[PDB]
């Protein structure tokens, strides 16, 4: 390959998403008077915005990601249950369907979060996983990716804490004990609302073709095998469509139960190549180098 | 905010979403959700530009008639395809283009209606009392055009 | 801090039956309220709950159609609608002093209970 | 329905010995229950919650332990004040739970 583009058509803009019982217990940027307590069940319903990430990767193998995820505690502690299970980096494929990270870190939140309270909908079983750059890389034939770009940003907008228990305790040398109507202490956690700043034309990475003439591995973008994976991650175009439809058409005031809702969104791609055809002379020099690669190479090939 | 420019020899050609024929596999109710089919047409001066609100029909698409406001309350927000216009092999669509826009959240709000697919009960966990009724699951954003300048 | 109650009345079977229970220096909207029963030989059973902002309520299983906790700002009550003899018995409010999860039934700062009886 | 039984009348005990009651649960609660000393005149008054933290204008001569599903209370030392009647409680708040946290005596030491 030579130059690629990625098109789009679709228009610019955001999208939205949030949980109708999300693990907030109060607010905490300014407190008038102190937190009340808290029963059973306090959820409420918000949403927020994702942060505005654009991606594009070109390779011959499909490209490594990786997220945090549960792993086995050791032997010799016991396991209460309840208790902080293990953390350990996890590398695996990515593939599409799987989600890209939030701002809410990169982890499964299947295993390691047992509430499914404390992210929005589309994230709240998928895992959410961040590209390797750096092993990808260190990669020493240079097969996962010829040349990748990516723009990201993200700021706070809101800060709550989360209602739920003291997982580990605050030492009694931190702070002066309180007394009177503060002799118990708020919840000492936080988690930030993210959100996107304003999406522009100036910032896009699509629609713009691609000459390449290096990279940064050895392999000079050739399409071993007769294959070509292409990763594509744009979160600017992604405007929620609203519809409704009537029950009955012959009504004349407003009711709420004669219309549903749905929600549905729209996506749209078209990739165009340049392939530039190139031989390889055999020798029984070359031949071993190239079944040191892969097997199934030189296999494919009757030679 | 929106700012476009095309010369062309031919008119330009836009695209926006539509309603189609659905399959009769099941009977359409009163109240189902309706297909969407990506539509084709040509733009005529009166059209409204997309507005943050998805380039979608609002008259057959939207009967509710109170979700946008009124300018584009019956018209039809068209967005110009370029894809189309410079794949035509001869190119008389369009020989010169330029475009900048931008666009970002205000505020958030909540769809007042019929919840018309729930979500399915194994993505949260049932409470009790004030919240064993689960508040709407639709959203929409209020967007708002950043500053206008002179250069 | 100290939970203060309303003085207790020799009554029929038949007739409703109130008892308010006021506090002295913290707030009831922050904290939550509880009623407990204590019945002579062991007697100690313990009636409902009632919560802060949420002002949500949960009894026990035998108490259903029979109690009804109401709440201002100022004062705290429980409701009997239709006595049965077998409660005659010493009752308790109490604050949950709880944390920001928990709303455990811990009740720290007790009252100091009065005589309810029932007599045909 | 998570149940504390409590079947066990007290021993009787002399000045400076050592008593075990025992609480048992049948479901897992976590750490969450109370104790409470029940003098036979006026109202009651805890001493210790969550098994391990005890309360403000009580001597540490009282004791916590017990994790899962049983727990126990042990001091030593017996005064003259401690006839009184004992109380282990949970904090699960179900609803539909007859609890009454029952159970629990103490003997006129001699």
């Known amino acids: 390959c030579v130059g690629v583009e990625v098109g789009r058509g679709q228009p610019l803009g955001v999208g939205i998403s949030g949980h109708p019982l999300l693990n907030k217990l109060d607010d905490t940027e300014n407190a008038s008077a102190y937190a009340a307590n808290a029963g059973v069940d306090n959820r409420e319903c918000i949403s927020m915005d994702y942060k505005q990430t654009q991606l594009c990767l070109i390779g011959c193998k499909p490209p490594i990601g990786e997220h945090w995820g549960k792993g086995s505690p050791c032997t010799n502690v016991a396991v209460n249950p309840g208790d902080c299970p293990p953390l350990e980096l996890i590398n695996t494929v990515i593939q599409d369907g799987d989600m890209v990270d939030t701002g809410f870190g990169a982890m499964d939140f299947t295993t390691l979060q047992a509430n499914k309270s404390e992210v929005p909908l589309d994230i709240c079983t998928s895992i959410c996983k961040y590209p390797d750059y750096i092993k990808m890389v260190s990669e020493p034939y240079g097969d996962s990716l010829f040349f990748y770009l990516r723009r990201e940003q993200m700021f706070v907008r809101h800060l709550f804490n989360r209602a739920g228990a003291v997982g580990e305790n605050v030492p009694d040398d931190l702070y002066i004990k309180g007394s009177g109507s503060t002799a118990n202490l708020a919840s000492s956690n936080y988690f930030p609302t993210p959100s996107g700043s304003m999406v522009t034309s100036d910032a896009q990475i699509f629609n713009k073709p691609y000459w390449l003439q290096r990279a940064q591995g050895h392999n000079n973008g050739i399409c071993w095998g007769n294959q070509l994976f292409v990763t594509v991650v744009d979160t600017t175009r992604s405007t929620n469509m609203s519809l409704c439809a009537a029950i009955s058409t012959s009504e004349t005031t407003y009711k709420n139960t004669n219309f549903k809702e749905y929600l549905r969104h729209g996506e749209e791609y078209d990739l165009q190549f340049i392939f530039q055809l190139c031989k390889i002379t055999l020798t029984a020099d070359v031949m071993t180098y190239i079944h040191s690669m892969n097997s199934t190479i030189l296999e494919d090939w009757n030679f | 905010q929106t700012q476009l420019c095309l010369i062309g020899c031919k008119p330009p050609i836009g695209e926006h979403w539509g309603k189609g024929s659905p399959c009769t596999n099941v009977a359409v109710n009163p109240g189902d959700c309706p297909p969407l089919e990506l539509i084709n047409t040509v733009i005529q001066d009166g059209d409204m530009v997309d507005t943050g609100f998805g380039a979608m029909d609002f008259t057959t698409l939207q009967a509710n008639k109170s979700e946008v406001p009124l300018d584009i309350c019956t018209s039809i927000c068209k967005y110009p395809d370029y894809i189309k216009m410079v794949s035509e092999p001869y190119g008389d669509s369009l020989f010169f283009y330029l475009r900048r826009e931008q666009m970002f959240v205000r505020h958030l709000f909540n769809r007042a209606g019929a919840v018309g697919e729930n979500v399915p009960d194994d993505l949260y966990i049932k409470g009790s009392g004030s919240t064993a009724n689960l508040a709407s699951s639709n959203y929409f954003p209020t967007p708002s055009g950043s500053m206008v300048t002179s250069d | 801090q100290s939970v203060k109650e309303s003085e207790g009345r020799l009554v029929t079977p038949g007739t409703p039956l109130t008892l308010t229970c006021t506090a002295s220096?913290?707030?009831?909207?922050?904290?939550?309220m509880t009623w407990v029963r204590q019945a002579p030989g062991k007697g100690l059973e313990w009636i409902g709950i009632?919560?802060?902002?949420?002002?949500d309520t949960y009894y026990a299983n035998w108490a259903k159609g029979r109690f009804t906790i109401s709440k201002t700002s100022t004062t705290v009550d429980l409701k009997i609608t239709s006595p049965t003899i077998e409660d005659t018995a010493t009752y308790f409010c109490?604050?949950?002093?709880?944390?920001?999860?928990?709303?455990?039934?811990?009740?720290?700062?007790w009252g100091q209970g009065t005589l309810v009886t029932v007599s045909s | 329905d998570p149940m504390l039984t409590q079947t066990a009348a007290s021993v009787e005990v002399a000045v400076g010995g050592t008593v075990t009651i025992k609480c048992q649960a049948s479901?897992?609660?976590?750490?969450?229950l109370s104790w409470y000393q029940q003098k036979p005149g006026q109202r009651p008054k805890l001493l210790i919650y969550?098994?391990?933290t005890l309360a403000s204008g009580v001597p540490s001569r009282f004791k916590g332990s017990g994790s899962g599903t049983e727990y126990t209370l042990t001091f030593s030392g017996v005064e003259c004040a401690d006839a009184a009647a004992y109380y282990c409680?949970?904090?699960?708040?179900?609803?539909?739970?007859?609890?009454?946290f029952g159970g629990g005596t103490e003997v006129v030491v001699k």
């Open positions: 109490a604050r949950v002093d709880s944390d920001s999860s928990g709303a455990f039934d811990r009740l720290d700062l």
């Open positions: 220096g913290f707030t009831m909207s922050r904290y939550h």
């Open positions: 009632i919560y802060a902002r949420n002002s």
């Open positions: 479901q897992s609660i976590g750490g969450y």
């Open positions: 969550r098994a391990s």
């Open positions: 409680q949970q904090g699960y708040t179900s609803s539909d739970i007859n609890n009454a």
